[PDB]
Amino acid sequence: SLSAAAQACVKKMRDAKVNEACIRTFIAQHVMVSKGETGSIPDSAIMPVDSLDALDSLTIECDNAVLQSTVVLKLNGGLGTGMGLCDAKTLLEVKDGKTFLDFTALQVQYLRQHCSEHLRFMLMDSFNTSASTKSFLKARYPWLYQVFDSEVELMQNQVPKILQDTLEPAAWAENPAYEWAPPGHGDIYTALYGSGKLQELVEQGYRYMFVSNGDNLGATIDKRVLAYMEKEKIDFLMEVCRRTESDKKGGHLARQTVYVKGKDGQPDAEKRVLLLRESAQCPKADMESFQDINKYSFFNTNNLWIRLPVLLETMQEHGGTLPLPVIRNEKTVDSSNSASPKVYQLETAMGAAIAMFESASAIVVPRSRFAPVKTCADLLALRSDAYVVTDDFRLVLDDRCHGHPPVVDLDSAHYKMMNGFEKLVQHGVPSLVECKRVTVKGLVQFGAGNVLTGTVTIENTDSASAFVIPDGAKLNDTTASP
Numbered sequence: 001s002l003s004a005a006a007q008a009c010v011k012k013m014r015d016a017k018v019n020e021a022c023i024r025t026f027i028a029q030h031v032m033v034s035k036g037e038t039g040s041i042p043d044s045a046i047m048p049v050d051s052l053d054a055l056d057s058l059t060i061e062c063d064n065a066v067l068q069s070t071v072v073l074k075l076n077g078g079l080g081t082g083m084g085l086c087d088a089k090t091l092l093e094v095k096d097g098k099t100f101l102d103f104t105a106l107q108v109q110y111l112r113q114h115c116s117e118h119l120r121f122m123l124m125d126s127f128n129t130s131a132s133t134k135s136f137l138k139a140r141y142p143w144l145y146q147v148f149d150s151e152v153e154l155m156q157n158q159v160p161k162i163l164q165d166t167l168e169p170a171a172w173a174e175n176p177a178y179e180w181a182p183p184g185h186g187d188i189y190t191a192l193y194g195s196g197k198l199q200e201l202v203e204q205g206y207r208y209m210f211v212s213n214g215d216n217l218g219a220t221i222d223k224r225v226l227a228y229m230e231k232e233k234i235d236f237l238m239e240v241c242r243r244t245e246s247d248k249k250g251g252h253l254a255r256q257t258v259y260v261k262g263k264d265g266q267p268d269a270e271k272r273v274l275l276l277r278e279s280a281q282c283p284k285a286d287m288e289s290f291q292d293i294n295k296y297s298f299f300n301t302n303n304l305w306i307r308l309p310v311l312l313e314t315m316q317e318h319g320g321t322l323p324l325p326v327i328r329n330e331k332t333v334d335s336s337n338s339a340s341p342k343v344y345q346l347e348t349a350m351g352a353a354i355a356m357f358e359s360a361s362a363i364v365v366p367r368s369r370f371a372p373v374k375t376c377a378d379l380l381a382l383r384s385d386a387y388v389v390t391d392d393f394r395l396v397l398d399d400r401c402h403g404h405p406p407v408v409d410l411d412s413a414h415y416k417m418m419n420g421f422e423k424l425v426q427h428g429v430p431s432l433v434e435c436k437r438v439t440v441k442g443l444v445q446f447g448a449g450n451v452l453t454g455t456v457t458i459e460n461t462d463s464a465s466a467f468v469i470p471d472g473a474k475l476n477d478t479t480a481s482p
C-alpha cells in the first residue's frame, strides 16, 4: 500500500501516459527513498576487486551466428549541463568536420561492410536530443534516417521530480516541463522492456547487446568478448579499465562477499558479487576514498554487454522491472533558479545491472576502448593530436602515450563551459601527444602550432587581460605566463 505521495506520483504518471513498466520501476525506487535510502554505498560496505580476466589474453572470435545476433546501442539522451551544453553532446565536433555522431555512423557503416551487413544499430534518445539527432542523420546518413523510427531510436522515459520533504511530485507553474527529469541511463532496461522492444529483439533472434556511452568513440564490438561470453556462459559483462589520474567522473567496480552454504558435508562456500559505485553514490564526506585510484583501480568504461533473453526473463520474473540500486540526486525544480523548491530526481546507472545476474562479470580491457568526454578538459584531449582515428573509425590514444592520456586541467572559471573552452582553442588545438600534463590557470588563448611536451602549466596571474600564446610556440616542462 502506497503512501499518499507515492500514489500522487503514480497518478501523475498515469495521467501523463507514462509507460507502466517505468511507473512500477520508479515507484519501487520511491518506496526505498521514503524508507531512508539515500543511494549511498559506504566504504565499509564494499571491498576492492583484485582479479579479473583480461581481454588482451583472449584470441578466439565468436562464430557468425553469435555475431549476427548482436545489437549495438549508443546512449544519447543526457544533458551536458556541466559543459554548458543545451543539446546532444554527440553533435559536437571531435576532429575537423566530424562530430561524435559522424564517427559513430562511420563505425556502424564499417561493420556493415565488413562484419555483418544487417548489423542492428540503436541510439537511446531523450526528447531533448531526439529531433537534433534525427535531423543530423537525415542530412548526413540517410540510410540510418530511413529506419530511424522503425529500428534505431529507443526513447528514454521521463520521471517526476519529487519534493524533498513529502516526496510528492513537484509542480512548477512557470514551466511545467521542469516537473520531469530523465531517469539516468539505467533507464535503458526499463525503456527496452516497457516499449516492447526488448521482447521484439529477442523474437527476431537477437541474443546480445553491446552498449556504450555516446561520448566514448573507442568502443566497438570485439568478437572475442562474444566468444568468451558464449563459453564462460556470462549473461552480463562490464568492461573496466585500469584507473588513471583522469578518471574522476564516473564509477568504479567493487565487490562484496556472499555466503552460499550449499550442500551437505561441504562447508561455507564464499561467493564474490560485483557492484558499481558511481561518484554520486559515495557519501559526500568520504569522497577521498572514491578518489583514491589505488584502492579502487577498476574504472567502469560503461562498455557493457548483455544477453537479451536473460535480461528479458529476469525482468519478467521480477514484476517487469530491473531493481537497480536507486541514486538520489538533489536539485531544484528549476535547475537555474535556486529559489525554486528542492527536489530529488531518482536515477539509476546502466552498469549497476552487474549485480543483477548470477553469472555477471567484468573484464579488464586496454585503454584504447575508452576515450571519455565528460568535461571540456577531456574534449581538449580528444581534439588534440593525442588521439588518432583508426581504420574502423574509433578514436584511440596515440601509441606514444602508452595508454596514458594527457592529464588536462583547465581553470573552471574560464573553461568549464563550452563557450569558454571554445575561445581557448579559437586559434588552434595544441599538440598534446608528447604532453603528459597541461594545466591552464586564468584566462588564456592558444595560438597556432602550439606544441606542448612533458609537464606544462600556463599561468595568467594577470587576469584582466587574455594571455595569448604566440604562434608556433613550443612549451617543454615549463610554466609559461606573461
Ligand SMILES: O=c1ccn([C@@H]2O[C@H](COP(=O)(O)OP(=O)(O)O[C@H]3O[C@H](CO)[C@@H](O)[C@H](O)[C@H]3O)[C@@H](O)[C@H]2O)c(=O)[nH]1
Residues within 6 Å of the ligand: 075, 076, 077, 078, 079, 089, 124, 125, 126, 156, 182, 183, 184, 185, 187, 212, 213, 214, 215, 249, 250, 251, 252, 276, 278, 299, 300, 301, 302, 349, 350, 351, 372, 374
Ligand atoms: O538519463 C540519461 C543520462 C545519460 N545518458 C547518456 O548515457 C551516457 C552517460 O554518461 P555521462 O552522464 O556522461 O556519465 P556518467 O553517468 O557520469 O558515467 C557513466 O560513464 C562512466 C564512464 O565515462 C562510468 O565510469 C560510469 O560508471 C557510468 O555511469 C552518455 O552517453 C549520456 O548522454 C542517457 O542517455 N540518459
